[PDB]
RNA sequence: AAUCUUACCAACGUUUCAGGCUUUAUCAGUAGUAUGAUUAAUAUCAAAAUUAUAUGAUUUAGUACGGAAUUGCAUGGCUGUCGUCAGUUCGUGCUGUGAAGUUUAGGAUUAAGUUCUUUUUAACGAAUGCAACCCUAUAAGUAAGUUUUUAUUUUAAAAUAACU
RNA sequence: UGAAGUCAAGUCCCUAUGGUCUUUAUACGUUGGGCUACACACGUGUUACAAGGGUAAAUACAAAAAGACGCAAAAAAGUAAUUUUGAGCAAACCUUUAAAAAUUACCUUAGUUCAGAUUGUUUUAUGAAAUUCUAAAACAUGAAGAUGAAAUCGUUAGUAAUUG
């Protein structure tokens, strides 16, 4: 009765994220930038609600990860005609998060109906968009719950 | 009558709607025609009907909604060449930046 | 959109005094020759002064642009040249002082075509400059408009530019 | 060279209409002898028949014979008048 | 100081008048303009939930105020989660507490229900067999109708031919 | 040749992109698309907005529209109607026809309205009996059978006063071109046990011969009933010719044979059809050309190739 | 010309669909067939069948979703627009030509 | 994989063991290094830097030797870009004056 | 990164017909009946229950025409309730085909419909149809 | 004329929010084109009074120069239109 | 540039708005389509089957007709090149009758109107550009780590191999 | 990343626009054709004239980028192009990607096991459609060319060149 749950969340955020050691110290030649600050509300969720999390139903092992990826839009000609050299390039930069945390459980849910597949997955994941900010929006999301079905 | 853009957008529109609805028809006919295991006749009678249709709504070619110019298009944005040089001045394009590798 | 909405017809947090004082009158004395040009548009004097200060503060290219277009259209195509010489002095001398207060820095405005002329007559280019308009400063900020004016002689394109901190 | 054999040869809407009108016995005439869509292959039933083929702003004439079968209409007709550098 | 404000979420309807009688003189867009403060429409909320948009904004420049919206959004997340997490505890708590019975199987839309009504000579062709597979499994795009309507167009090619066509 | 051609212009119509629905709000005093699940949550919020707010102000529109929808969706709400009937004095002899239709339509179908609530709308429906549409009046007949608050007698006297002049005057245009306006009417009467000869005359001229009767369940139930009136002899006018036409449809059309019996008088099951799976009764079914259009040419095609022999 | 030469190899070119003898099936063959009913797989020879064109995905409507935006032409997507000023300039300039056209017709 | 069975030719092989002569600790140790990226010659010269940096943690006496042989310095030198109107980095179209 | 595919010469060509390997079809036997199966689960009185693990995804992008992106429903199934013999295991590794499978669990995916419910029940109809056809062996 | 290459895009991603802040994946074409359809609907809905239009013709029946000039909106001065996305909102 | 594209040539055909709104008149067993016939093709005609889905299909008048037709020596807008050369220019003050110059002339330095200098009874300051801030590759230091990254190590089960 | 502005440089034929012209035609839709013609000649660029090469067989290491009107592993067939088949993935998770070189062996300076055009005929792929007017593979055809006059161009280190 310590069945495991798996939740993997991805985000998108165009601007650079900032290191938390770098708030009191940062070079004035870089101070006028933009950053996607406050990308850590995900971590904060498991400290405010630490008192509400029961012992039957408890999160643990929450971790983040960073990546970067460029998409290519193409080199577009800059003139109306007869200038092949004139090409201004265009591209797109992104930064993805990858949250991943487990929550244990004493329960194990039973299934007896199709509608139960909707009561537990489809209503929650569609209502998971709250876990979001303006710049930090989410592409995908995952939930894994062990279950029981009485086939035959 | 209509100016060139608002006309030509409709031509390239009606060509797709035809395809959208004769989709299932033209996928089954073409399925039989390439089914080598069948006799040749039924493979041909489908080829006979497959041509007995409006080809005019099949000669599709891309177009830009804004300029009316057809040859160069950015599929990532769905708009043209003469326009992106303009919007890039205004910065209207979202999340784009100049590649400095 | 299949999604929830909230629309916010908000206003600016800025307001103006109720009492005339010196610092209004100092502007009215300088902006007098424009009053003739201003009456053609049925535009008031009080309102024109405000929108610029809203513009220097709020940094919205769209607002101060429409003020021009209502003037530059109601006028006749002889008189555009003078209106700008009064606009150059107005920005360059009077309002150049407000810049450092509002963390504001830079103005630039470039016309294109037949600002005043008829039939077969040359192009002319007019400019306005004050403060900083740099482009290789990737850490400097900007906002950019590319505009259009119609006449009986032809067409005129204008480029507003602006910069702030 | 040509297509693979299993890719059956092309005969458009039109010639399929004409082959049927042959089958009924309806003779070929001013407009029925007319041909377009040259890529359509030259069928076998229509031996002993004239067909006025189209190019540009006028036409060409031919009769069908068993040797002409299998080919395409547009391989017998010339579109571009040949080029000769003058003296 | 922050101006006054209004909020309008579907209670709009109750105040609404007929269309046979409306103010032809005064327009809403004018009322929005001449009336002080600010005005807000939004699609609605629950009792436990906060307005999405911050009702007030410190600055007026775009660049300098948008962080006030990030702070607001994060400031909004919490009551929605206690409503979410609390349910996610409760639903699971029902199901392990429910009793098990056999899985109450239910109906799927499939094309085989039409296939097994057709006679042999259609069912035995390589065509219609290969139809009912790929239109059943590898094509979710289509309705239950558009697939059944596809066989009957394929079954026509099971039939023989006249001598004209041949 | 013209551009655009008519066959093209239908493409944009069949997909539905020719409309602009916000214009409908100015045409209909009630307008609630519910084209999305978010929009539906906007409905439930109203229902909780009322239960929580005992003190509440309204207009005549927002009241009547909510009832129209709850009736249309069929949600049960014994608490909503008593809360809203209080205000009905506010809009006596004032409401539009379209709105007077709604709360009327909902009071019947709800099976929850008061005899005072129904009394308020019946005075208004009559007050606008001319401008009201025919298809609207027909849906009222669909609700009399679904309501049980009233006795069927009062529903009939109300049907003779206000509803007959609508339909009979607006028969040739609003109803006659349409089959759906007729079918729901013909079903709506027998379920109400009302039989007037001013209508069944006007109705039966057209129904049994239409192509619009595409669903066999629409064909059959007309055949199910018209065979019964003969047994009872209720209607005086002869009907024998009408019924024979429906039999020929039920026989000739190969679908009806595959789903229905005249003699056994029922539909087939799914299992029973598998028994008749391989029984191929059809005669001379095959790929063809000109057959049902011009079979003369097929005969010529036999002569020519025979002459070559 | 058509140079043909003899192929000293024999027999049908083998295939899963051809190794099968439905009258005499092995255990490994009934098992695969029992998978095909489940997931809808296909068994066919080395030669082409039409399943590759029944399994394909062909989404033409996604282009219409661009044509249905009507961002490029507001009047086609939002007919309540009425460009008042642009019509005024269009009318003034026309009428002034007609002054010129008639006055030049005399002159 | 095995040493002779991955780095086939010996000039790829002496590079990686050039430090091991400079240490004189031959056969004392057992080596296991995992590499991914680049081509064979560039994939070998990295093995100089890694052992030379690995040994000096053990034998810091060997440092001024590895300084002289430049086995501890990286090679930031990396391939250049293809400009637009150039066939590649530093290669332009033919100039035409007539 | 990915290393490149290479066709190694595993088997030599010309090896005598007598020295080759050939393996019979172990699945050739008399298949079980139904009551033989039900007699195995007498501890549970005609009732079997399976432990499984349901993955599922959602997207903010699944809308007007990409609304089909939310149709997959990935599942795993645990086997230790399945008292699988040596012959029952190999039969099960064939039905799945060239698909993932371990001693502990195996995958099951369906993307046959638009709505995930219909793709979820189909997994149950597969799990049943695979357990029976698997336990039809001894 | 010397080539003043694209200044704003050289500055945007590192020093300036774009005219809107949202982002999307697999739906870049819709939102980028659909908000442009809404920037100008609202402009042309406000800067030109259309509530007076929707009354006269769209509605059945059973000042004019004053509107074509938009005299009622002569004091109106818009600054921007902005768009956002998060939390399904 | 296979068709479309494509503007050009030849020929058949069309004669004024796509959607929305207003309006005139007729039809409603009529209307429509993965239908059928017809033409080279758009077009045009129509009841064997099928669809019937609220408030129709067709028609008159009106709601900015149209134009790759011309003048880039009437213009915008976009762009090439002189040139990645290092210059262009303003406010005030000084000098000269004045044009104008100084500043932007000396010394050195710089790839650079680059920077430094106490060259001077006169220039001080300011904008733009070059530069630099930003991105790629590097070492050193900190911060985070994935069922997806890589390696060292370890727990438990199955197969294979070994045999404790 | 690129100032001021010059070359009345270029474009009204991407879109906008002033003047001018046309409006039963300088406008519009469709079918077919044409832009792919061939005396002489120019600019650009790929492949070769060989042995630091060609070929057969066995068989290593990459980056960057893209993916559902898609990528498509594993097994199997074919001589080969490629096809059957579609596990798995909307993603650092699954997938699409190397050659030159190095090793072993033959060819032994020959207009040649170099070169590889051109042409005939089947097969392979897309499409409604390949003749005018597509690309690729095989059997077979197997021309010129034997490092190029006067003249002239690119390059400054991870550059030239070579490899994909
Ligand atoms: Mg094409
Ligand atoms: Mg395949
Ligand atoms: Mg062409
Ligand atoms: Mg053409
Ligand atoms: Mg023309
Ligand atoms: Mg010129
Ligand atoms: Mg000087
Ligand atoms: Mg690089
Ligand atoms: Mg890096
Ligand atoms: Mg010229
Ligand atoms: Mg050309
Ligand atoms: Mg070579
Ligand atoms: Mg090999
Ligand atoms: Mg692989
Ligand atoms: Mg393979
Ligand atoms: Mg699959
Ligand atoms: Mg080699
Ligand atoms: Mg030779
Ligand atoms: Mg050779
Ligand atoms: Mg030689």
Tab-separated table of N, CA, C and O in Angstrom, chain I residues 37-112:
chain	number	residue	atom	x	y	z
I	37	UNK	N	-9.901	-23.868	-17.820
I	37	UNK	CA	-9.381	-22.573	-17.408
I	37	UNK	C	-10.033	-22.131	-16.108
I	37	UNK	O	-9.352	-21.742	-15.153
I	38	UNK	N	-11.363	-22.169	-16.064
I	38	UNK	CA	-12.085	-21.742	-14.874
I	38	UNK	C	-11.731	-22.580	-13.654
I	38	UNK	O	-11.822	-22.094	-12.521
I	39	UNK	N	-11.327	-23.833	-13.858
I	39	UNK	CA	-10.894	-24.674	-12.750
I	39	UNK	C	-9.568	-24.229	-12.155
I	39	UNK	O	-9.226	-24.677	-11.057
I	40	UNK	N	-8.817	-23.367	-12.840
I	40	UNK	CA	-7.572	-22.871	-12.273
I	40	UNK	C	-7.826	-21.839	-11.186
I	40	UNK	O	-7.167	-21.862	-10.141
I	41	UNK	N	-8.769	-20.926	-11.418
I	41	UNK	CA	-9.087	-19.873	-10.457
I	41	UNK	C	-10.314	-20.287	-9.645
I	41	UNK	O	-11.423	-19.793	-9.831
I	42	UNK	N	-10.092	-21.211	-8.712
I	42	UNK	CA	-11.109	-21.587	-7.741
I	42	UNK	C	-10.953	-20.855	-6.422
I	42	UNK	O	-11.921	-20.769	-5.659
I	43	UNK	N	-9.763	-20.325	-6.143
I	43	UNK	CA	-9.584	-19.467	-4.982
I	43	UNK	C	-10.463	-18.230	-5.063
I	43	UNK	O	-10.870	-17.690	-4.028
I	44	UNK	N	-10.777	-17.782	-6.277
I	44	UNK	CA	-11.506	-16.547	-6.502
I	44	UNK	C	-12.934	-16.765	-6.982
I	44	UNK	O	-13.674	-15.787	-7.127
I	45	UNK	N	-13.339	-18.008	-7.237
I	45	UNK	CA	-14.728	-18.347	-7.542
I	45	UNK	C	-15.204	-17.662	-8.825
I	45	UNK	O	-16.193	-16.926	-8.842
I	46	UNK	N	-14.476	-17.917	-9.909
I	46	UNK	CA	-14.885	-17.413	-11.205
I	46	UNK	C	-14.634	-15.941	-11.414
I	46	UNK	O	-15.323	-15.315	-12.225
I	47	UNK	N	-13.659	-15.370	-10.710
I	47	UNK	CA	-13.407	-13.933	-10.729
I	47	UNK	C	-11.917	-13.677	-10.830
I	47	UNK	O	-11.156	-14.081	-9.948
I	48	UNK	N	-11.508	-13.017	-11.905
I	48	UNK	CA	-10.123	-12.634	-12.108
I	48	UNK	C	-10.025	-11.117	-12.133
I	48	UNK	O	-10.924	-10.437	-12.634
I	49	UNK	N	-8.922	-10.595	-11.600
I	49	UNK	CA	-8.659	-9.163	-11.562
I	49	UNK	C	-7.218	-8.913	-11.973
I	49	UNK	O	-6.307	-9.630	-11.547
I	50	UNK	N	-7.015	-7.886	-12.794
I	50	UNK	CA	-5.714	-7.563	-13.358
I	50	UNK	C	-5.230	-6.219	-12.843
I	50	UNK	O	-5.992	-5.250	-12.799
I	51	UNK	N	-3.956	-6.166	-12.469
I	51	UNK	CA	-3.306	-4.924	-12.085
I	51	UNK	C	-2.667	-4.318	-13.323
I	51	UNK	O	-1.955	-5.011	-14.055
I	52	UNK	N	-2.923	-3.033	-13.557
I	52	UNK	CA	-2.445	-2.349	-14.748
I	52	UNK	C	-2.001	-0.940	-14.378
I	52	UNK	O	-2.248	-0.457	-13.274
I	53	UNK	N	-1.347	-0.284	-15.335
I	53	UNK	CA	-0.821	1.069	-15.178
I	53	UNK	C	-1.189	1.894	-16.402
I	53	UNK	O	-0.690	1.635	-17.501
I	54	UNK	N	-2.047	2.888	-16.208
I	54	UNK	CA	-2.589	3.712	-17.282
I	54	UNK	C	-1.854	5.045	-17.420
I	54	UNK	O	-1.985	5.921	-16.563
I	55	UNK	N	-1.097	5.207	-18.505
I	55	UNK	CA	-0.590	6.519	-18.891
I	55	UNK	C	-1.644	7.221	-19.728
I	55	UNK	O	-2.465	6.584	-20.391
I	56	UNK	N	-1.623	8.545	-19.681
I	56	UNK	CA	-2.510	9.334	-20.514
I	56	UNK	C	-1.943	10.739	-20.558
I	56	UNK	O	-1.353	11.210	-19.584
I	57	UNK	N	-2.133	11.399	-21.697
I	57	UNK	CA	-1.647	12.750	-21.913
I	57	UNK	C	-2.768	13.713	-22.253
I	57	UNK	O	-3.855	13.324	-22.685
I	58	UNK	N	-2.461	14.988	-22.054
I	58	UNK	CA	-3.321	16.079	-22.461
I	58	UNK	C	-2.434	17.148	-23.081
I	58	UNK	O	-1.215	17.145	-22.901
I	59	UNK	N	-3.051	18.049	-23.836
I	59	UNK	CA	-2.343	19.154	-24.462
I	59	UNK	C	-3.198	20.407	-24.411
I	59	UNK	O	-4.429	20.338	-24.428
I	60	UNK	N	-2.533	21.558	-24.353
I	60	UNK	CA	-3.212	22.823	-24.582
I	60	UNK	C	-3.435	23.098	-26.058
I	60	UNK	O	-4.160	24.038	-26.394
I	61	UNK	N	-2.823	22.309	-26.938
I	61	UNK	CA	-2.868	22.525	-28.371
I	61	UNK	C	-3.932	21.686	-29.061
I	61	UNK	O	-4.205	21.908	-30.242
I	62	UNK	N	-4.538	20.735	-28.360
I	62	UNK	CA	-5.568	19.887	-28.940
I	62	UNK	C	-6.862	20.667	-29.087
I	62	UNK	O	-7.652	20.779	-28.147
I	63	UNK	N	-7.069	21.223	-30.272
I	63	UNK	CA	-8.179	22.116	-30.557
I	63	UNK	C	-8.544	21.903	-32.024
I	63	UNK	O	-8.187	20.875	-32.610
I	64	UNK	N	-9.192	22.904	-32.626
I	64	UNK	CA	-10.191	22.786	-33.687
I	64	UNK	C	-9.972	21.627	-34.648
I	64	UNK	O	-10.880	20.813	-34.849
I	65	UNK	N	-8.775	21.539	-35.236
I	65	UNK	CA	-8.425	20.430	-36.109
I	65	UNK	C	-7.318	19.537	-35.574
I	65	UNK	O	-7.150	18.428	-36.093
I	66	UNK	N	-6.570	19.972	-34.561
I	66	UNK	CA	-5.642	19.095	-33.860
I	66	UNK	C	-6.257	18.501	-32.602
I	66	UNK	O	-5.530	18.049	-31.714
I	67	UNK	N	-7.583	18.471	-32.513
I	67	UNK	CA	-8.241	17.876	-31.363
I	67	UNK	C	-8.069	16.365	-31.299
I	67	UNK	O	-8.459	15.761	-30.295
I	68	UNK	N	-7.511	15.741	-32.336
I	68	UNK	CA	-7.214	14.319	-32.310
I	68	UNK	C	-5.928	13.982	-31.570
I	68	UNK	O	-5.632	12.798	-31.399
I	69	UNK	N	-5.161	14.980	-31.132
I	69	UNK	CA	-3.899	14.690	-30.462
I	69	UNK	C	-4.122	13.984	-29.135
I	69	UNK	O	-3.236	13.263	-28.666
I	70	UNK	N	-5.279	14.198	-28.509
I	70	UNK	CA	-5.655	13.489	-27.289
I	70	UNK	C	-6.552	12.317	-27.668
I	70	UNK	O	-7.774	12.364	-27.542
I	71	UNK	N	-5.919	11.255	-28.148
I	71	UNK	CA	-6.604	9.996	-28.404
I	71	UNK	C	-5.838	8.779	-27.924
I	71	UNK	O	-6.461	7.740	-27.686
I	72	UNK	N	-4.524	8.864	-27.764
I	72	UNK	CA	-3.749	7.731	-27.296
I	72	UNK	C	-4.032	7.458	-25.832
I	72	UNK	O	-4.241	8.379	-25.039
I	73	UNK	N	-4.035	6.180	-25.477
I	73	UNK	CA	-4.112	5.766	-24.089
I	73	UNK	C	-3.179	4.582	-23.923
I	73	UNK	O	-3.495	3.470	-24.354
I	74	UNK	N	-2.035	4.823	-23.309
I	74	UNK	CA	-0.998	3.828	-23.139
I	74	UNK	C	-1.236	3.099	-21.827
I	74	UNK	O	-1.681	3.697	-20.845
I	75	UNK	N	-0.949	1.806	-21.822
I	75	UNK	CA	-1.248	0.944	-20.694
I	75	UNK	C	-0.136	-0.077	-20.532
I	75	UNK	O	0.511	-0.472	-21.505
I	76	UNK	N	0.082	-0.493	-19.288
I	76	UNK	CA	0.884	-1.663	-18.993
I	76	UNK	C	0.063	-2.635	-18.164
I	76	UNK	O	-0.938	-2.267	-17.548
I	77	UNK	N	0.508	-3.888	-18.156
I	77	UNK	CA	-0.207	-4.974	-17.503
I	77	UNK	C	0.800	-5.818	-16.745
I	77	UNK	O	1.845	-6.168	-17.295
I	78	UNK	N	0.480	-6.169	-15.509
I	78	UNK	CA	1.363	-6.977	-14.684
I	78	UNK	C	0.999	-8.448	-14.823
I	78	UNK	O	-0.172	-8.805	-14.964
I	79	UNK	N	2.022	-9.303	-14.762
I	79	UNK	CA	1.894	-10.695	-15.167
I	79	UNK	C	1.917	-11.688	-14.017
I	79	UNK	O	1.557	-12.849	-14.226
I	80	UNK	N	2.332	-11.285	-12.819
I	80	UNK	CA	2.511	-12.266	-11.758
I	80	UNK	C	1.188	-12.841	-11.282
I	80	UNK	O	1.176	-13.918	-10.680
I	81	UNK	N	0.078	-12.148	-11.533
I	81	UNK	CA	-1.224	-12.777	-11.376
I	81	UNK	C	-1.452	-13.838	-12.439
I	81	UNK	O	-2.223	-14.777	-12.219
I	82	UNK	N	-0.796	-13.709	-13.589
I	82	UNK	CA	-0.937	-14.672	-14.671
I	82	UNK	C	0.094	-15.753	-14.394
I	82	UNK	O	1.297	-15.532	-14.558
I	83	UNK	N	-0.373	-16.922	-13.970
I	83	UNK	CA	0.518	-18.053	-13.739
I	83	UNK	C	0.897	-18.631	-15.095
I	83	UNK	O	0.365	-19.641	-15.561
I	84	UNK	N	1.846	-17.958	-15.737
I	84	UNK	CA	2.195	-18.251	-17.117
I	84	UNK	C	3.202	-19.387	-17.190
I	84	UNK	O	4.259	-19.336	-16.554
I	85	UNK	N	2.875	-20.405	-17.974
I	85	UNK	CA	3.770	-21.521	-18.202
I	85	UNK	C	4.811	-21.143	-19.251
I	85	UNK	O	4.829	-20.028	-19.778
I	86	UNK	N	5.693	-22.090	-19.566
I	86	UNK	CA	6.673	-21.853	-20.617
I	86	UNK	C	5.999	-21.752	-21.976
I	86	UNK	O	6.451	-20.993	-22.839
I	87	UNK	N	4.917	-22.501	-22.177
I	87	UNK	CA	4.213	-22.507	-23.451
I	87	UNK	C	3.218	-21.362	-23.560
I	87	UNK	O	2.962	-20.871	-24.663
I	88	UNK	N	2.648	-20.931	-22.436
I	88	UNK	CA	1.760	-19.778	-22.445
I	88	UNK	C	2.517	-18.484	-22.682
I	88	UNK	O	1.980	-17.556	-23.295
I	89	UNK	N	3.758	-18.398	-22.208
I	89	UNK	CA	4.530	-17.172	-22.371
I	89	UNK	C	4.874	-16.937	-23.834
I	89	UNK	O	4.662	-15.841	-24.364
I	90	UNK	N	5.416	-17.957	-24.501
I	90	UNK	CA	5.817	-17.809	-25.895
I	90	UNK	C	4.623	-17.487	-26.778
I	90	UNK	O	4.738	-16.696	-27.720
I	91	UNK	N	3.473	-18.097	-26.498
I	91	UNK	CA	2.263	-17.762	-27.239
I	91	UNK	C	1.939	-16.286	-27.094
I	91	UNK	O	1.496	-15.639	-28.050
I	92	UNK	N	2.146	-15.737	-25.903
I	92	UNK	CA	1.817	-14.341	-25.678
I	92	UNK	C	2.822	-13.421	-26.349
I	92	UNK	O	2.455	-12.334	-26.804
I	93	UNK	N	4.084	-13.837	-26.427
I	93	UNK	CA	5.086	-13.022	-27.092
I	93	UNK	C	4.896	-12.972	-28.599
I	93	UNK	O	5.495	-12.111	-29.250
I	94	UNK	N	4.083	-13.862	-29.164
I	94	UNK	CA	3.813	-13.860	-30.594
I	94	UNK	C	2.632	-12.971	-30.949
I	94	UNK	O	2.666	-12.272	-31.967
I	95	UNK	N	1.584	-12.994	-30.128
I	95	UNK	CA	0.393	-12.208	-30.414
I	95	UNK	C	0.702	-10.724	-30.419
I	95	UNK	O	0.240	-9.985	-31.295
I	96	UNK	N	1.477	-10.268	-29.439
I	96	UNK	CA	1.915	-8.884	-29.429
I	96	UNK	C	2.799	-8.583	-30.626
I	96	UNK	O	2.803	-7.455	-31.131
I	97	UNK	N	3.552	-9.575	-31.087
I	97	UNK	CA	4.411	-9.420	-32.240
I	97	UNK	C	5.760	-8.867	-31.849
I	97	UNK	O	6.331	-9.261	-30.828
I	98	UNK	N	6.276	-7.947	-32.658
I	98	UNK	CA	7.538	-7.274	-32.364
I	98	UNK	C	7.229	-6.060	-31.495
I	98	UNK	O	7.334	-4.906	-31.912
I	99	UNK	N	6.832	-6.354	-30.264
I	99	UNK	CA	6.413	-5.334	-29.323
I	99	UNK	C	7.119	-5.560	-27.994
I	99	UNK	O	7.589	-6.661	-27.698
I	100	UNK	N	7.194	-4.499	-27.194
I	100	UNK	CA	7.839	-4.593	-25.895
I	100	UNK	C	7.120	-5.586	-24.995
I	100	UNK	O	5.889	-5.660	-24.974
I	101	UNK	N	7.908	-6.340	-24.234
I	101	UNK	CA	7.380	-7.339	-23.319
I	101	UNK	C	8.498	-7.780	-22.388
I	101	UNK	O	9.621	-8.030	-22.839
I	102	UNK	N	8.202	-7.881	-21.099
I	102	UNK	CA	9.153	-8.333	-20.098
I	102	UNK	C	8.529	-9.468	-19.302
I	102	UNK	O	7.379	-9.856	-19.523
I	103	UNK	N	9.305	-10.012	-18.366
I	103	UNK	CA	8.747	-10.973	-17.425
I	103	UNK	C	7.724	-10.322	-16.509
I	103	UNK	O	6.827	-11.001	-15.999
I	104	UNK	N	7.834	-9.014	-16.301
I	104	UNK	CA	7.010	-8.294	-15.344
I	104	UNK	C	5.811	-7.615	-15.979
I	104	UNK	O	4.749	-7.553	-15.354
I	105	UNK	N	5.940	-7.103	-17.199
I	105	UNK	CA	4.817	-6.408	-17.809
I	105	UNK	C	5.040	-6.226	-19.302
I	105	UNK	O	6.117	-6.505	-19.834
I	106	UNK	N	3.988	-5.752	-19.968
I	106	UNK	CA	4.011	-5.496	-21.399
I	106	UNK	C	3.071	-4.340	-21.702
I	106	UNK	O	2.159	-4.043	-20.928
I	107	UNK	N	3.284	-3.709	-22.852
I	107	UNK	CA	2.557	-2.507	-23.226
I	107	UNK	C	1.330	-2.836	-24.068
I	107	UNK	O	1.238	-3.891	-24.698
I	108	UNK	N	0.390	-1.896	-24.081
I	108	UNK	CA	-0.807	-1.979	-24.908
I	108	UNK	C	-1.285	-0.571	-25.211
I	108	UNK	O	-1.533	0.212	-24.289
I	109	UNK	N	-1.411	-0.261	-26.493
I	109	UNK	CA	-1.682	1.081	-26.983
I	109	UNK	C	-2.840	0.986	-27.964
I	109	UNK	O	-2.988	-0.003	-28.687
I	110	UNK	N	-3.664	2.029	-27.983
I	110	UNK	CA	-4.748	2.146	-28.945
I	110	UNK	C	-4.915	3.608	-29.314
I	110	UNK	O	-4.998	4.472	-28.438
I	111	UNK	N	-4.950	3.864	-30.617
I	111	UNK	CA	-5.235	5.170	-31.186
I	111	UNK	C	-6.219	5.031	-32.335
I	111	UNK	O	-6.055	5.634	-33.399
I	112	UNK	N	-7.249	4.214	-32.131
I	112	UNK	CA	-8.156	3.825	-33.197
I	112	UNK	C	-9.312	4.794	-33.368
I	112	UNK	O	-9.892	4.857	-34.456
